[PDB]
Design goal:
Protein name (chain E): ATP-dependent sacrificial sulfur transferase LarE
Number of helices of chain A: 11
Organism (chain E): Lactiplantibacillus plantarum (Lactobacillus plantarum)
Largest interface: A-D, 25 and 26 residues
Distance between the termini of chain A: 39 Å
Oligomer: homohexamer
Active site (chain E): 150
GO molecular function (chain E): sulfurtransferase activity
Shape of chain A: globular
InterPro entries (chain E): LarE, NAD/GMP_synthase, Ni-pincer_cofactor_biosynth, Rossmann-like_a/b/a_fold
Chain lengths: 249, 247, 261, 261, 233, 249
């Protein structure tokens, strides 16, 4: 079908819903969904929601809030206590499912209280999403990634989160129990490192050993910082501060 | 003049031409011309043409065909066999002239058969082609004007690195073949895969001479051994780095 | 409160002032101020002023002028001779104040002679400069939201700093040494270093770079050395603390670096 | 006083002892003791013993045996089974003591059977005559030069036990793993190196002055040590002997860090 | 100490001798041990001058033997007069060695020597590299060339004709690179291409010199100046 | 025209002087003179003098003193106040001359008090003339190779291989040397050598330190930038810089 056909389906669905709450992450897909909601229903019938939690950074949160606001949406932050769920706290392969469940349940409460007829996300052409009744309008309208990019150009979208972030749990081996203290340690360490000019970085947690992953093309750049990173990450609680010779991943 | 003034010039020229064929390469300048053609004349009076040849990458071709569809154009690939011209095949200093001639002659045949009033290419201000309209250059667009107008229209996806014909990797007088072209293309592909989007593997028979931007040569050192061994398996005996860098 | 209320304040202030002169630098904030004044008051009740001086580059002047013309404003170029004020020439610690004084006094003279009721700037002043975005309590996020809402996409993304910051307090600025510093920084930017300072210490050039670029710089040491010597420096040096020193240090040595300063 | 006085002290001590056994490691200090012992007492009243064990290299044994012979000493190899002691095998914090005890007890059996009056070793500022004669490190270099000594181990050797955390059991397999990894790194041009063993993590220590040089070897080292059984191959950002070279304030800070474990 | 008698007994028995003196520590050792055992008037040290090795190495060899107290003789070999060497065949090393040893036997026959030493009598005494340091220091020897040289022929492909001009080009290039702090280097000659071999551990250090090295080797006649990613050997 | 002839000249000149004072620096030439004086005149008729001042390090002084005793000489230190001479204090281009003058004048006072017939130094054929100091190696026509030959003949193998430079070379002409800025320069160079850079200079430009390094070492230096910056600031420099021209730029 034509992009025009897929847009028209998307427009009619939003019109039928009147008021919507949008799970906004700042990537191109939820930016497009949010923009179409604003265009079709107006600012007063759309609520953009950005989740703040212990598994993600303040910076990513602040950036999504500012991106939605710059798009012209009324934006709402909401904070989830993911570690209160044992499946997430124990870093299991299904923790991702339970986090999504807690997130979409919080979104339905926001939508119940603001009069929205649905919660919208940015899925394109996933159990917790369906168990919650959140709607993926781009996927119903048969949007593929190139259809998303085409519509965004047509609407003048140029700004969106290009990199998707990974939960801090990926810095810990499966079975290592997530604690408030070890999360903060890893998060302070990655924040200090990003501040030096390394936006793509991981500090993998091996108890007293920090194992730093950098893109190999950047490792030469790092050398002037060895001592300051060593001492800063030791003050965060690591005993040995190391750089993985294999690089990022 | 202002950008608004230059945009209006471009708009009036498109309106006057009614139906157009666009030489589409996927860079910012051809992306801008194609978008403006579509915005002013509509999909049914614009044909985007992407050249498929041995002298540019399959990757570049695939990205350009996908970009033209994403902009909302009907896209047509056209297959050019540049090596069929002896000046190009034997890489004479005149090769550029005959390559340009073969390209613009094919675009004029495509435009004649679909009823277009002109061929459009992406040439800008600061080389001119009688068999095509370079509307950005007629409207006095400079590079900053191209970037400013693209941002104003929401255009974001285009090839950021400028491409050059693979014949530039061979000395004048060296005959280009399917085998030695494939060798050069594979070497540069691997180097690009390591994070060096601007790279040249100049072919000197058994020697590869790699050109990198000087700002990147310090970064390269972590890759020396993998590059050495990979380009040897492609058929080079010695793999080298040019101390003068790219350009 | 809302963007809508803050815009309405700004519109009412512009409407009430009738005719304005705008200090236009080409950044996002003065781009928004100029655009809103044009939208509310019309082309014939707005004068955009772009100042050319020895403390900023001809390139920045040209970019500001074309950006103001691109918005459709009637533009006034004016030249300030900052080195004629002895505090600026001899670079005292309050030197910035007298330059701002000289700048705003010329803008008020322009505004008085064209019938403007105020001079407007892009602040989000001791002589009457009005920052309408700041009275409407615009934050940086509000400026970005309204600019997107009005179709503004083009503005100077890089903020400039007066060339005076390249000279120590007490060193007298001359036409020649300013040109020396400006040429040096331009050459370094041409090598791929957009963020750079060449601090002037008579016969010494002390170069500030972001530390993450110092490793890359090494391939250029000899070319930079010989070029900046040909511009008149006797010694060409690299500051080991980098650009904006202390900013990227650990907690204990960033404390130590700041105590030293 | 002067070197001559300290040499005379040493000569008087050797003459008083008549026959001696020397624990010879090939470093500069034990070379000096052995050369001075031979000069004063003659070949037949000195026995050089080089210890071979599972905690040190075959290189180290062969070089020490070859170096003692080149000085002209009657040299005797002896093999110690350090892993037979549970304190050494299980790498306790005092494991160093039991290794030293077993070594010096074996040396006394050697000395008892040779008619030696004492065992001599290389301690500076069992009998350490260099320490009794007030030899500092600079005194050792000066006397070694005066006597024509040119050949000795430039790199100090440390027992392989130091590559394992306290409490980790040493095995032939993990010992062989650490030694092969270090041999491979020495083969690339890094003679001062340690490969610290943390089960699936290798933590490589290098002199900081060499870490910039290492980058060309990253991928080969990663892959080689993984084939030796490590899952992750890492580089310690503090380097070999961390804190010895830091500025005054960050040496104190790293001291509180180190002392905390 | 044990070895001293073995070497000394051979030299004393071997009449009067001429020693192929290369300037390295051991040709220094053999020459010095030859002098004290057989006396100044019965030893001639010979230093070979040619296009395949450096003038610097030749000049220092002549001073080292003379300051050691030996009668010193320079001799010039025209290796390129031999077609195998001029055309750089894989066996050219063999034909060069023949030329070298035939010239020394002519000198040794002409001055009454009973042999030339480089017979390697120091090797007969089973001296290892460590033995060289012990005896040379022992006799007060402190001056010698520490780095051993390899013939310039190895900088050219097999089959490539050596010329006076190509050699000087290669030799000035390597000399300039050594001047910059890279004592171990080869500039392999590929007509218009220079391919520089460095120990891989030094390639990072080289970067500060890229542009000066590029322009300098171009002024010596190269069109392209490159660095071999595989490193030295 | 031979070595023995040059040796004999030196022996005859020493024998004629009976008792001597030797300006001893530890280099090979003053080592040779000292050894020959002892060999020819006996220990009781040679005084080796090592100058101690603010223009060189305690470490350099200690090394010359110990090298002289290792030769078997009676050695005596003497302390010079070079900063008392305004040519030295204000670092004019003529400063080297007045330091040498002050040095050779003190050596004459020692030699008068111990009954020496001359002051000996190590100048060879390859301020002093105005003082009556004799360069016997230079009168006997010793070239550098002659010195090396005789040192070998006498078994001398130990001497300072590294040539020292007066701390005056760290200051621009016209800059006044003080006890404090000298100590500042020497502390900075000491720290830099301790990091593995034996060939280094910290050039003094008031509040700016300009470090000169051999260019082949600058890439290696980067791992130490921040520690060097902070250490030399703690010594009193405001700005710590690296000369892009390298050592002896």
């Amino acid at each position: 079908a034509t992009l025009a056909t897929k847009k028209a389906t998307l427009v009619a669905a939003l019109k039928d819903l009147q008021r919507v709450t949008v799970a906004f992450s700042g990537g191109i897909d939820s930016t497009l969904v949010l923009k179409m909601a604003l265009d079709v229903l107006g600012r007063d019938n759309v609520t953009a929601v950005v989740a703040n939690s212990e598994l993600f950074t303040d910076e990513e949160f602040d950036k999504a809030m500012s991106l939605a606001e710059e798009l012209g949406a009324n934006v709402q932050g909401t904070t989830l206590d993911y570690l209160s769920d044992d499946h997430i706290k124990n870093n299991t392969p299904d923790s991702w499912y339970y986090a999504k469940k807690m997130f979409y349940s919080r979104l339905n409460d926001i939508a119940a209280n603001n009069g929205s007829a649905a919660v919208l996300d940015g899925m394109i052409k996933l159990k917790a999403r369906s168990e919650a009744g959140a709607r993926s309008l781009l996927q119903e309208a048969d949007f593929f990634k190139t259809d998303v990019r085409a519509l965004a150009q047509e609407l003048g979208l140029t700004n969106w989160n290009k990199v998707a972030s990974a939960s801090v749990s990926s810095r810990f081996p499966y079975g290592t129990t997530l604690t408030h203290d070890n999360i903060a340690q890893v998060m302070a360490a990655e924040k200090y490192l990003r501040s030096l000019g390394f936006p793509t970085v991981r500090v993998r947690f091996h108890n007293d050993i920090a194992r730093i992953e950098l893109p190999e093309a950047r490792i030469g750049d790092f050398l002037v910082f060895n001592d300051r990173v060593n001492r800063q990450l030791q003050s965060l609680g690591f005993r040995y501060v190391t750089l993985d010779l294999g690089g990022f991943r």
